[PDB]
Write a protein that binds this ligand. Structure first.
Ligand SMILES: [Zn+2]
Lengths: 117, 86, 639, 186
DNA sequence: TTAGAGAATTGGAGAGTGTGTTTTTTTTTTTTT
DNA sequence: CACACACTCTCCAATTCTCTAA
């Protein structure tokens, strides 16, 4: 199944979907942090695989069960894992554009093997 | 300030059991074969009484606290008094 | 650090797949052992050598490619035993402060790395070959040179099997080869499993019985006996279809819950306003309740719609089960089934006799009877599973084992109540004892079912002995009257309830079949006055505590709970004991369950007791006050 | 051996990494325990305090303000830095000597009462002789004191003395023996 | 066997400290005028 | 400047542990 840009409503959040669109602008490829490795500064314990939200996130607790630290952490950039990241604007293709409408644009995120394709 | 407690002497025998004696004077149970809705009505009335007594807690937390309070002098003396006359 | 680096460099280097040892390996290894012996209490040399990964980079290649060089091989084995020493032995305990706990976690991390490295079949092949050519000699031909080498080899295997799974990589999904599964596969392919069977069955080498028992315990650490015994050729199709069906069941449950939530909230956005006065409901003041959370919520109104739950304080936080169960790799499960079968048929009686001799002679470590009781539970359960043959476990069926388990269980119970600083550990030891006791009580039932009149005779003998002696009857009440959710897990509560159900089943059937009146200087007995001891508030409180998880309980567990409560209510007329407000909240959940049809027994019992309560309530309105507290003999005053 | 003082532990990565510390200490006790020597630091947050190794690994000391004005030791180590923002000089000097000896290595309850108390009326609670000796702040109100008593006069460290709404007719000359009194209300 | 009086530990109220903010014109240059 | 947020620390008292009597 294929969906229109007009059909990307909130009901489709989190569902696998296929759309057609015309690329309008592609931004530079960046490295995006996918999982941070952190050092606890007041007990020297290393917390691995801290998964990232849509905000840059530190450990919620220290991995050491008796350590009371919850904000003093240092990212180790060399031991963390990054992914290639690129955002592109698209709009509705000429065929799918409803009559009289302004073209509806969408933001698409490309990752890893798919960037700059 | 007077931070309140669900304890044996502030409210459990003042706004608690004396009012709980009266809560079900006007209840509307219908007996055998309708135990589900009878229990729903009972739970709603008990929950409402508990809320008006100590509004800080949820109903099951209130229950787990009052079951512990069942061991205290004032509570069991009031329980026996309510069993006997008034 | 740098001096250790120098010696570690002096060990040699790997090239492609061949290790080129330096001629000064012997003195460098002795220096490494000296540093480890002169460690700080923080175990700095342990941490540094683990960080350098010399166990993975030097010692395993040396062990696997220069095993003919006997002095170097012996030195490497001793060094590897020292390095693989478990962290609980390294530090004595789990540290209570951050710095030592960080060091503990470091040593544990490097131990997990060693366990990852040790899955190579070549290492265990060398270990099996050297142990085999050693044990080829007669016992009288051995000296300290070879006996100490057997000790160090078996301790190396024990150390590598003992290591806890990494919290990071314990997220493996079922039917996948964990590090422990790969290690067991390495043992299988190396053939050290057959050497362990030989050591267990040997009368001459009985001196290693405790060691071999610990190896077998750590091997079968993760498994369940009935689940393991069910393994066979046709399991792939069964498990595939089961996985698909369970996936669909989970999906349907989630869809149902989503629809119920979608109905509970309205079809208007949350900032769509509107307020109501519920005229009958007085607020916390005298004014009528003003409701703001939408008309949809007033169908199932409750005052706790917007309340934050409470922080359970640290002391009152319930105990949680220490591990999830995962279905290990099918190859490893088949191998463990075959190991367990051959061990049960060829080894088990002699090994258990030897371990009992060691415990009697008191040449065992402090808690080795826990391994003994584990072996009782696991292998008797496996025996009853599949082809039950009591001859394979006849060393365990004596009344002396009942007495030993009862003594250990009472000892652990006392030590749990007194030694409060490791009460959870004493509870776990008591849980092992309880499971062993449960398996004995199940085995006598299987002996009754079995056709042999001889085993039926001995089953009658042991049943007469156990039901005559008082402690076997009183221990269940002793456990119920001081069980604590704060300390003991719900798995323990499940096992206690099921064991109590089985025990009362056997005792009731025994007394129903024949009188056998004298019990305990003897006195009369009857099962009804025994059951009246279970009319206490604490035991039924524990039973409803287990009943709260009826959604997650097994069907057999739910049957045990409801059958006991039905026995207390219908047959002993103690419904007023179970007339309680918390129990009524649980019944409210049971009646409101969308899957209530799946719990037909529980809802029928709930409706029976609810009907009795509302009859009493119509007769007398003070029953509503009586619901609020647990009781003693108000159970009769209400009546 | 033990030392009572405010403590602030600063991990030395923070400044070069661009992160700023709290800027003040926390009331604590330091213990020089020892088979091998440890430093235990315990605060309100942790009765079971944090250990620190010092057998061979003190970096250096700072001593410019050991007279206990704007003071510290600023004891640096691999990697932490320990600051002691307020103590008493003699005991701190003895503690530093013991620390130096432990680092050379070859040889060898924070209870408190608040500033403040209040009596809203004598019949609810009389002052009695149960006051803290070094109390800093007290209110007495609606009490029938015709004249101020030795009970409040003998307090060694009062900043605030309030007798408002009491019934004092005369006040003494010995109320002026309060060295640090900054607030007097009648 | 229950529970109540004295001592110790934990929850959280609140006192104290630090941070962040409120279309227009003249000139160039390329292409198009 | 100055008026709201955001964060930490301390003290106070309420709950639970331990030992005793009803
Ligand atoms: Zn930490």
């Amino acid at each position: 199944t294929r969906h229109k840009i007009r059909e990307l409503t909130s009901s489709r959040i989190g569902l696998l979907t296929r759309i057609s669109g015309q690329v309008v602008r592609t931004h530079p490829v960046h490295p995006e942090l996918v999982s941070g490795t952190f050092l606890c500064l007041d007990c020297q314990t290393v917390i691995r695989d801290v998964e990232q939200q849509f905000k840059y996130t530190q450990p919620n607790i220290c991995r050491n069960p008796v350590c009371a630290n919850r904000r003093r952490f240092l990212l180790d950039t060399n031991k963390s894992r990054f992914v290639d990241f690129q955002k592109v604007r698209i709009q509705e293709t000429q065929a799918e554009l409803p009559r009289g409408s302004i073209p509806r644009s969408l933001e698409v995120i490309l990752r890893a093997e798919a960037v700059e394709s | 300030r007077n931070i309140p407690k669900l304890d044996a002497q502030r409210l459990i025998s003042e706004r608690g059991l004396p009012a709980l004696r009266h809560v079900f004077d006007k209840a509307k149970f219908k007996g055998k074969g309708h135990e589900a809705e009878d229990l729903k009505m009972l739970i709603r009335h008990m929950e409402h009484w508990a809320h008006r007594l100590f509004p800080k807690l949820q109903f099951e937390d209130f229950i787990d606290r009052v079951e512990y309070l069942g061991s205290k002098k004032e509570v069991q003396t009031c329980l026996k008094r309510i069993r006997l006359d008034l | 650090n740098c001096e250790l680096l120098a010696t570690c460099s002096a060990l040699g280097y790997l090239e492609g797949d061949t290790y080129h040892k330096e001629p000064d390996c012997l003195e460098s290894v002795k220096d490494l052992i000296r540093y480890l012996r002169h460690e700080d209490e923080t175990r700095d040399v342990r941490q540094q050598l683990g960080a350098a990964q010399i166990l993975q980079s030097d010692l395993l290649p040396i062990l696997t490619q220069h095993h003919q060089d006997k002095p170097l091989f012996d030195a490497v084995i001793r060094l590897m035993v020292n390095l693989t020493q478990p962290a609980l032995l390294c530090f004595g305990n789990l540290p209570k402060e951050p710095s030592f706990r960080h060091h503990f976690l470091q040593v544990l991390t490097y131990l997990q790395a060693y366990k990852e490295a040790f899955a190579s079949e070549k290492a265990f092949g060398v270990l099996s070959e050297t142990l085999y050519e050693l044990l080829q000699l007669g016992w009288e031909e051995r000296q300290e040179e070879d006996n100490l080498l057997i000790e160090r080899i078996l301790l190396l295997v024990r150390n590598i099997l003992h290591v806890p799974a990494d919290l990071d990589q314990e997220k493996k999904i079922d039917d996948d080869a964990s590090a422990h599964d790969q290690l067991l596969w390495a043992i299988h392919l190396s053939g050290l499993d057959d050497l362990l069977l030989f050591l267990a069955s040997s009368s001459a080498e009985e001196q290693w019985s405790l060691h071999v028992l610990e190896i077998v315990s750590l091997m079968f650490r993760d498994q369940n006996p009935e689940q393991l015994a069910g393994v066979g050729q046709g399991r792939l199709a069964q498990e595939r279809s089961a996985d698909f069906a369970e996936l669909e069941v989970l999906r349907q449950r989630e869809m149902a819950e989503k629809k119920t939530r979608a109905l509970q909230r309205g079809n208007r956005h949350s900032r769509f306003g509107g307020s109501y006065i519920v005229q009958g409901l007085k607020s916390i003041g005298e004014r009528d309740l003003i409701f703001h959370k939408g008309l949809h919520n007033l169908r199932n109104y409750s005052s706790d719609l917007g309340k934050q739950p409470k922080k359970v304080p640290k002391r009152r936080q319930a105990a949680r089960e220490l591990s999830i169960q995962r279905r290990s790799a099918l190859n490893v499960r088949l191998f463990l089934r075959d190991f367990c079968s051959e061990f049960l048929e060829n080894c088990y009686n002699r090994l258990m006799g030897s371990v009992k001799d060691h415990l009697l002679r008191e040449k065992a470590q402090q808690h080795d009877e826990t391994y003994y009781m584990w072996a009782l539970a696991f292998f008797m359960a496996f025996n009853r599973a599949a082809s039950f043959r009591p001859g394979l476990v006849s060393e365990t069926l004596s009344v002396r084992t009942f007495h030993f388990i009862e003594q250990n269980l009472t000892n652990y119970y006392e030590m749990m109540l007194t030694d409060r600083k490791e009460a959870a550990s004493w509870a776990r030891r008591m849980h092992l004892a309880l499971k062993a006791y449960q398996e004995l009580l199940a085995t006598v039932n299987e002996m009754d079912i079995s056709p042999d009149e001889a085993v039926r005779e001995s089953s009658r003998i042991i049943k007469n002995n156990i039901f005559y002696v008082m402690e076997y009857r009183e221990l269940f009440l002793a456990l119920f009257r001081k069980f604590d959710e704060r300390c003991q897990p719900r798995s323990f509560l499940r096992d206690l309830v099921e064991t109590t159900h089985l025990f009362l089943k056997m005792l009731e059937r025994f007394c129903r079949s024949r009188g056998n009146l004298v019990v305990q200087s003897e006195k009369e007995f009857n099962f009804l006055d025994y059951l009246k001891r279970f009319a206490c508030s604490t035991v039924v409180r524990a039973y409803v505590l287990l009943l709260r998880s009826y959604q997650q309980n097994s069907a057999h567990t739910n049957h045990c709970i409801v059958k006991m409560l039905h026995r207390l209510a219908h047959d002993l007329k103690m419904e007023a004991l179970l007339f309680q407000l918390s129990v009524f909240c649980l019944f409210n959940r049971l009646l409101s369950d969308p899957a209530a049809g799946a719990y037909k027994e529980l809802v029928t019992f709930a409706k029976y007791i609810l009907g009795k309560f509302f009859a009493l309530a119509a007769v007398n309105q003070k029953a509503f006050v009586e619901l609020l507290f647990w009781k003693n003999t108000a159970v009769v005053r209400e009546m | 051996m033990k030392l009572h003082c405010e403590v602030e532990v600063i991990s030395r990565h923070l400044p070069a990494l661009g992160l700023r510390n709290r800027g003040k200490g926390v009331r604590a006790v330091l213990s020089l325990c020892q088979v091998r020597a440890f430093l235990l630091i315990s605060t309100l947050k942790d009765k079971r305090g944090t250990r620190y190794e010092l057998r061979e690994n003190i970096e250096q000391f700072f001593t410019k303000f050991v007279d206990e004005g704007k003071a510290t030791v600023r004891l640096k180590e691999p990697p932490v830095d320990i600051c002691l923002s307020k103590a008493i000089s003699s005991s701190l000097k003895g503690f530093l000597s013991a620390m130096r000896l432990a680092h050379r290595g070859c040889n060898v309850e924070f209870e408190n009462f608040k500033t403040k108390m209040v009596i809203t009326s004598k019949k609810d609670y009389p002052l009695s002789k149960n006051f803290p000796y070094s109390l800093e702040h007290l209110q007495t109100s609606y009490c029938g004191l015709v004249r101020v008593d030795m009970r409040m006069l003998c307090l060694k460290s009062l900043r605030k003395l309030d007798l408002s709404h009491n019934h004092i007719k005369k006040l003494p000359a010995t109320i002026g023996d309060l060295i640090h009194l900054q607030e007097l209300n009648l």
